[PDB]
Structures are given as C-alpha cells and as structure tokens.
Structure 1
Amino acid sequence: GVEIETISPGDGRTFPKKGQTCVVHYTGMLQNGKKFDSSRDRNKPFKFRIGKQEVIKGFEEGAAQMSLGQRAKLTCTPDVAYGATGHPGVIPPNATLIFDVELLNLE
C-alpha cells in the first residue's frame, strides 16, 4: 500500500514512463525513529530508470503517481520492502518506511 501525500507545486502532466531515467532527492525516515538514508548529504541524486526492479516496490510505484517538480510523502507497508527479510543492521524486519521524495527528472 503506497499512500501519497503530496506537497502541491509542479505541473501534474509530465509523467514517468517505462525505461525513463529520473533523478530524485529522496530522504529516508523511520516511523517513530531517526533517519536511515539521505541523498542530500552525498549530493549525488540517485539517477535511476523505471521498470527494472532496482529499487523496492514501495518506492517504485510512488514515483509513477508523481510529476515534475512535485514533492510527495511515501508510506511503505512492510510486505513490499523488508518486513519479512529486514536489511541486516540498517532496516530491522517488520518496519514501516517513510520517504520524503522530490521528483526532479530528466528524459
């Protein structure tokens, strides 16, 4: 369950398609916990394409429901990212994921 909470401004018409590489200033956040990831610190804003299962499934479907300039707020259920496995040392199992995501794409 991907539940978008959008900070408004953008265009609402430039939508990502298959095989299009998009650039995201994402920000990881744990519910009732601290940060666990940030693309703003490295200043390397994570060039990735659409449709190759590189990212987790909760992060993947949230980007297709956005547009250029927009600023959503992901809330990932544990079943789509790590809730059975748990990323060892960084993401414990049965974890609810929060992401501040800005979509500033190209292509």
Structure 2
Amino acid sequence: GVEIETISPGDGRTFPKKGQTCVVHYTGMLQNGKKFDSSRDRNKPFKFRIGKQEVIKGFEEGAAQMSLGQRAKLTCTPDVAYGATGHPGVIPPNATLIFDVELLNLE
C-alpha cells in the first residue's frame, strides 16, 4: 500500500478524478534519505494524467488521494513501485520510495 501524511494544509474538497491533467512539484528519495528526484532543480512542474497508467500505480493513487494545494509525504512500497526491476544506476532492486508532493493548479 501507499501511506500518506499531510505536511501543510490544502484547499480541500478538490480531488482529481480520472481524465484530468495534474501538475505537481515533487521530491523523491530512497528509504535511507538518498535524494534522486527533484522537480525543483528542473524548474518545471511534472505533468501527468490519471487513468493512462503512465506513472506507477502507487504514485497515481497517492496523488488522487490528496486534495488541491496540499503538501503530502507519500511512502510507496516496492510492490506498488518498480521493486525488483528498479532502475539501472538509479534505484536498487529492493527499496521503498518516499516522495513529497505538492499538488497545485488542477485542470
């Protein structure tokens, strides 16, 4: 499963359903606090749809669970993540990911 913990209050009562675009500003790291994604250095928000399964299922469920303008820490287990496959040179074949996500500008 995916665990969600709030960090800052959000707008609330605005959860993206299937079929919208969403822009997020996220930072993702290993279980041992090893940063390997940060959308802030690229200075562009990550754009993704819901229902196309382009992003991993854990990230999609975590993003759809929270509301607009909310900052949330999402812990994704390797089962709902790459897990054994991982990423050569990026992610070990067994790791639990922690991603902080600030959903904004729902469309």
What TM-score does the superposition give when structure 2 sets the normalisation length?
Answer: 0.94
- Residues in 1 aligned to 2:30 and 2:84: alpha-carbon distance in whole angstroms: 17
Could you say which structure has the higher helix fraction? 1
Q: Within 5 A, what are the aligned runs for 1:5-84?
A: 5-84=5-84
8 Å Cα contact 1:23-1:106 kept in structure 2: yes
Unaligned runs of 5+ in 1: none
Could you say which structure has the higher strand fraction? 2
8 Å Cα contact 1:10-1:67 kept in structure 2: yes
- The share of aligned pairs that are identical, in percent, is 100
Task: Give the deviation of 1:36 after TM superposition.
Answer: 0.4
Task: Give the deviation of 1:83 after TM superposition.
Answer: 1.3
Task: Give the deviation of 1:7 after TM superposition.
Answer: 1.7
Task: Give the deviation of 1:34 after TM superposition.
Answer: 1.5
8 Å Cα contact 1:73-1:99 kept in structure 2: yes
- Residues in 2 aligned to 1:84 and 1:48: alpha-carbon distance in whole angstroms: 24
CA RMSD of aligned residues (A): 1.1
Runs of 4+ in 1 over 4 A off after TM superposition: none
Query: Does the residue aligned with 1:6 lie in a helix, a strand or coil?
Result: strand
- Residues in 2 aligned to 1:9 and 1:33: alpha-carbon distance in whole angstroms: 24
What TM-score does the superposition give when structure 1 sets the normalisation length?
Answer: 0.94
